[PDB]
């Protein structure tokens, strides 16, 4: 009765991720010029067409076409490949009055919804091992593509990693990869390259190297990008988060300014959860926050430590409440979300990014949590 858990990732060239990138590149340009921007940018990319839509109210001007090209050119496309449509509508004044309170010391929630923060002790990143390996696999392939160490491949790619959790020590069951390749590729070269990368990633995490490898199970993958499959913003929300190990309330991240609690509260919840595990109050922690549009604080909260709590759950809940300010305006500012760049997190997950220096990944609340328990 093996216990096999599986998570996936997608590359920079994947059509859903292109949209996520463009949406966050646009957000970045807005916030860079106007830190009171309201931005809710959604992008569609389908065979020859990229539609840039959403609601924005901003003093900035963003050259939407130039921005799309910044993301698309490194993947291998040129200025004649896509028709670009710009349908940028302003934020609804009925929404704005509710978020931007008369009392300028409070920001009301950008929308209702539910978010989940999650953390665990399985990796240095405090993330499920399946997610971390899935992302690392694709990062390493993309890096080798750009360095030209791995040739005759294109940017569109997916990974799936199954891990065996039956014992105290995890075993990799299966590593799967689909990468878009050139017509004139060499399968032997391609297969040896991927395998070497699969083993290197396993060795780097001190794992077994005897796992089953599924390399390009379709048998052929030359048609790819938005030509092969349509892309949309926010259609990789589980890849963006915790790889199906954690729960998810439904909200997407990319293209959203921090007033959209779907994004800021999720980073806040990860911040809490991650620090809770780093403080060794639990092996795993999941935090659920719910919001109501226009209300400055969460409407409901739940902490779940999965029965891995080292101290009484009551004292964990109580430490969290005394160590964190749950006012939306306050946690936005505490996490420096108005000045953070989001493009780097539009690829390879928003969480456990030891390659980045994200505000919500900092273990700068362990002392307060410890002390308050």
């Amino acid at each position: 009765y093996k216990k096999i858990i599986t998570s996936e990732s997608v590359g920079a060239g994947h059509p859903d991720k292109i949209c996520d990138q463009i949406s966050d590149a646009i957000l970045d340009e807005c916030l860079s010029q106007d830190q009171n921007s309201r931005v809710a940018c959604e992008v569609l990319a389908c065979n020859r067409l990229i539609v840039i839509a959403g609601e924005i109210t901003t003093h900035a001007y963003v050259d939407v076409v130039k921005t799309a090209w910044e993301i698309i050119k490194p993947l291998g496309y040129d200025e004649n490949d896509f028709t670009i449509i710009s349908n940028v509508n302003k934020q609804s004044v009925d929404i704005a009055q509710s978020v931007d309170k008369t009392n300028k010391n409070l920001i009301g929630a950008g929308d209702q919804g539910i978010v989940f923060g999650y953390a665990c002790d399985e990796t240095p990143q405090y993330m499920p091992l399946t997610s971390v390996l899935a992302h690392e696999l694709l990062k390493e392939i993309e890096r080798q593509r750009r360095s030209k160490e791995f040739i005759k491949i294109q940017a569109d790619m997916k990974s799936q990693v199954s891990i065996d959790y039956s014992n105290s020590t995890p075993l990799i069951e299966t590593m799967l990869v689909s990468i878009q390749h050139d017509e004139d590729y060499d399968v032997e070269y391609f297969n040896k390259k991927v395998s070497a990368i699969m083993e290197q990633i396993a060795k780097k995490y001190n794992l077994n190297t005897n796992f089953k490898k599924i390399i390009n199970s379709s048998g052929r993958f030359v048609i790819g990008g938005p030509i092969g499959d349509t892309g949309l913003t926010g259609r990789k929300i589980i890849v963006d988060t915790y790889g199906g190990v954690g729960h998810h309330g439904g909200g997407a991240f990319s293209g959203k300014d921090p007033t959209k609690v779907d994004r800021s509260a999720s980073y806040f919840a990860r911040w809490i959860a991650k620090n809770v595990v780093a403080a060794k109050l639990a092996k795993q922690c999941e935090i659920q926050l719910a919001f109501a549009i226009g209300q400055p604080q969460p409407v409901a909260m739940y902490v779940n430590t999965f029965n891995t709590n080292l101290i009484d759950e009551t004292k964990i809940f109580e430490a969290i409440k005394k160590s964190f300010n749950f006012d939306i305006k306050t946690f936005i500012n505490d996490l420096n979300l108005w000045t953070t760049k989001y493009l780097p997190v539009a690829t390879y997950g928003h969480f456990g990014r030891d390659d980045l220096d994200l505000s919500w990944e900092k273990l700068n609340k362990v002392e307060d949590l410890i002390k308050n328990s």
Copy 2:
């Protein structure tokens, strides 16, 4: 307090419009051609509806007429939206992998992970938070169309928080935001919603003393895609188990059954639901993983959350002997080529006692019982 919260969205919500259109298109295709390959994605923003995705079909679907079928009942007309149709054709590199030469097997439409889930909390075998969230909006929409509830528009959301600290659940909070006319009467509006909140609570034998949050924005006249952009597959948690179950990431609407994101999810719900109805567990969650072109799942995990009535090993073993995991086989077993998907593009795909879905049938309890 242990407070768990789920949400729902109405027929007029912009994400749900796109989901409706995507599934209305699928329906037309499959109705004409049951070997259609369909992966329709829709965007709706301000004055624009883009209909895109990959389709290979012998059918012809009048994409504009279809968009209107969905949009007219919400109150829009033929001059409100520019319609763009960008239908691409399924990639031949994908098709060769899915359609094996001998039609004996179908390979998986894509890699990924799906989750089925079921529990004993409701007659629908669904989390109470989800069920209440959906029922709330169904009842508002029904009253809107009957004209019992006036001066409201179709765009709406709900959020239901339930207290699970005790053996008997309590409703903590019911929240509703509904789009209203400029000349609405707030008193009328607030009394109407409250009555509906209590009726939904009474119908599930629940407490009636819960906090009510009604239009916390204070104004909600601009709505629809004018207020907020919509896209297909951006309501995947509302579509499924309201954040109580896990999710592997795949959306449902606009996809033919070769896309295992949809078919395997319905299959997993079918399994999980029958497991709970057979009383082998109070809750069950099944995770299946796929590889593109492979006819069976690549991995499987059953989790009963320590609510198993018999040995977990025997539950896993009963599932394996009671269900055929071949993709082509479970598609046919669930009648997915002939099922209509538009009715599930609103108000969740699971626990629909208002519908007659193949994957909601408790027709596998006997086989599961017998095989343990």
Copy 3:
């Protein structure tokens, strides 16, 4: 030498595709609703076809299906173009002006100036340069469809220069550019075109020693909207009199008859053509001007170029007594609500001995003669 030149373009030319689609749309509207107001403009550029304009109608036209009717014969398929449909309704401020309270009169759809023209040079009563330019491309397209001329595509142009120094006209130059396949045979292609050039010259009893310019680019494989953008109403001189006659500016395709740019131009051609057929002149040009909402022309000018057989005053006077200048009346006299316009969206709107156009009928010669 007096060398006069006119051009034509083929069914596959991008401007003409738009003209075809615009008139195919009009046709569908009028076929269902003869009180349709239609002003359909179309753009076709590399992978995109935008269908726009103002329409008020009880009809429904499947704009995508219609675009395909026009594009399929040229060799395109259902995946070649993104279709955008942006059909806006007719302005109510315009409508009140055109549709008078008094239902006996229709006001002019817009201001502007139109020109009718006719001459005695051809059986069609059209300039010889125009007729030859159009015949050339018709014959190439017919041979393409019959498969007598292979390895060519539908996009093509012609230009015909004629020498008018003497009493008998001489062809100076015939020019043709046709889009060809990559693997075409130039020798075959050149012999084919030449034979067609000579056949067209022989059919009009003309010299056969003219210079031939065949595909002066040297290569013409990229064509259609991929090579060059197309728009409705960008072929107005090819549509009319090949630069021999004047033009006031208004385009024809996509317009219902309330748009005087179209109906008054056909009416002016009708007058002019009958004047020449009555032998009151060898050439005749009629200029009518309109004001929006006014049921009759605001100004009028007849020019017979000093080829008048009787006094000009008596020619003007015969015209006035032989024709009703009320807009509603000449629309009905010419049967414009029930005429099909797609056939005239290619190969000119005038002198179409291949068609049976109301405005080409010599049914006013007796009245003109009698009234002088």
Copy 4:
């Protein structure tokens, strides 16, 4: 009674907006890259502006910012239109034909026929009907921007009918339709337009008793692309000679000078205008035809309408000795790579005494005179 009529349209007219955007785009391209190949077509309908066409250039033009430059002065804002950009690349099969191996010649960008025209009726050497039609709308637009004429919008048309029965012309009718605000004052509106009609007539020493048609629709509040779709190159007669001259069909806006539809038309106007200013004819019309990839006209015809003051043979002969008909040469002679085209996308491309256009210069009169003597 011999009544000739011409029309004009305003800055806010939907066809003209597209023409403006097309030429504003061209301008940006040429400003950055003088070897640009540009063929930009624009559609504007209801809430949508599509920017399409084929461009090969080292430039980058922010198409959205450019559309706004044109649309903001008319009264629109950044939320009014969905903008689509479908810029395609010039066809390499066309480019090889235009950009000859011999870098000293440019082949014609396309086949076609152009017409230059000039006459002695006005200081601009243009038909009186055209001049009056354009002046009327310029003066309305100027007053709109100065705020002398209020509660009007930029979309507008004019039509001027003139009586040519006698030696001295008479204005028959002046017509104007202007888009107005809902709360306008008709009396104010009618007095304003009339004053402008009379001022324009007096300025050309014409009669002032003509019939005035002012907003014959009775209502014109819905306007712009909302009221009526716009496309590039659907005002080719307003752009040229108001239906007095002939036209071969090609449009001007959005085209670089390799498109002979534009450059050869300016060249033909240049010739014709100088021919009339040299007093060799009262009216002159020049017809040039081209073949794609050929560096010179394929055919040429001068028509003086029997108004030639000297023998026609000597006129034809002077033209040939005074003008170089090589395409590359006349492009350079007219400075077409460095000319701005946005100013001519409104109020006609010809007889613009308000501008300094290369093709309006009477700098070939001396050579024509000199070459037409025995």
